Amino acid sequence: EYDYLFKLLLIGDSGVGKSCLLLRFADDTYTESYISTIGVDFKIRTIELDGKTIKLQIWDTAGQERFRTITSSYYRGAHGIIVVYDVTDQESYANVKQWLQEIDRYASENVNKLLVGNKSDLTTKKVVDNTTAKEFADSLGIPFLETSAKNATNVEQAFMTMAAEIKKRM
Ligand SMILES: Nc1nc2c(ncn2[C@@H]2O[C@H](COP(=O)(O)OP(=O)(O)NP(=O)(O)O)[C@@H](O)[C@H]2O)c(=O)[nH]1
Ligand SMILES: *P(=O)(O)OC[C@H]1O[C@@H](n2cnc3c(N)ncnc32)[C@H](O)[C@@H]1O
Ligand SMILES: [Ba+2]
Ligand SMILES: [Mg+2]
């Protein structure tokens, strides 16, 4: 029986791997194919944390600009928002500031945030230095993790740490 029900949103630029992060966490599957999300997709996953059962309702948003006014509708309900960039794509990291701005515009004032640098397995094509991204996230008091949906690395931890932080402030 459920102790908490948290709503999470994944946002960030098209092609950074939001959908693959959710597929990995919710279905333990992965695809190398690129099929952009139309609007917002939804999955649930129940986790156990600190002896508590937490149901997570997770919305995976389209990163493409033409969906953006619609995706904004889901921001208010979120307890936690995960902002994803691709560690091989500098512009996706540069657009983190824009995404943080969407959060300020549309989200609840007390929303928890996490910055994720995805595709950490692409070690030879990495252009966003993790010390840079970590200094950035520190400067904002936002937690930071690098993930690989492909190799499963830190995927469970990203969702688990987000839940932990939500649970602490209630
Ligand atoms: N090597 C590697 N490739 C990844 C990883 N995650 C996603 N990809 C690849 O990146 C591409 C885009 O992934 P996808 O999850 O569809 O991106 P998205 O952020 O959901 N795009 P949109 O916002 O348009 O729906 C796919 O070709 C996918 O296989 C990762 O951790 N490692
Ligand atoms: P929008 O409000 O159109 O939602 C986008 C998609 O997510 C599905 N969905 C949203 N919220 C839930 C809940 N709370 N439970 C189950 N499914 C949900 C919508 O039905 C849309 O397809
Ligand atoms: Ba949809
Ligand atoms: Mg997607």
Q: Indicate which CATH number applies to the domain containing 24.
A: 3.40.50.300
Which atom number of ligand 1 is nearest to the Cα of residue 16?
A: 19
Q: Which helix (H) or strand (E) holds 42?
A: strand 40-49
For residue 20, the ligand closest to its alpha carbon is 1
**Which residues form the domain of 29?**
1-170
Best CA proximity match to 10, nearest among 165, 162, 166, 148? 162
Residue 55 neighbours by CB distance under 10 Å = 14
Deposited experimental method: X-ray
Domain count of the fold of the chain: 1
How close are the terminal C-alpha atoms of the chain, in Å? 18
- DSSP one-letter code for 85: E
Residue 118, annotated as binding a ligand: yes
Ligand 3 centre distance from Cα of residue 74 (Å): 12
CB-count exposure of residue 128 (10 Å: 0-12, 13-18, 19+): buried
Best CA proximity match to 139, nearest among 90, 96, 168, 89? 96
What was the resolution (in A) of this experimentally determined structure? Answer: 1.7
Q: Which tokens hold the place of 91? A: 């512009």
- DSSP one-letter code for 74: G
**Ligand 1 site, CB within 6 A:** 14-20, 31-34, 36-37, 62-64, 118-119, 121-122, 148-150
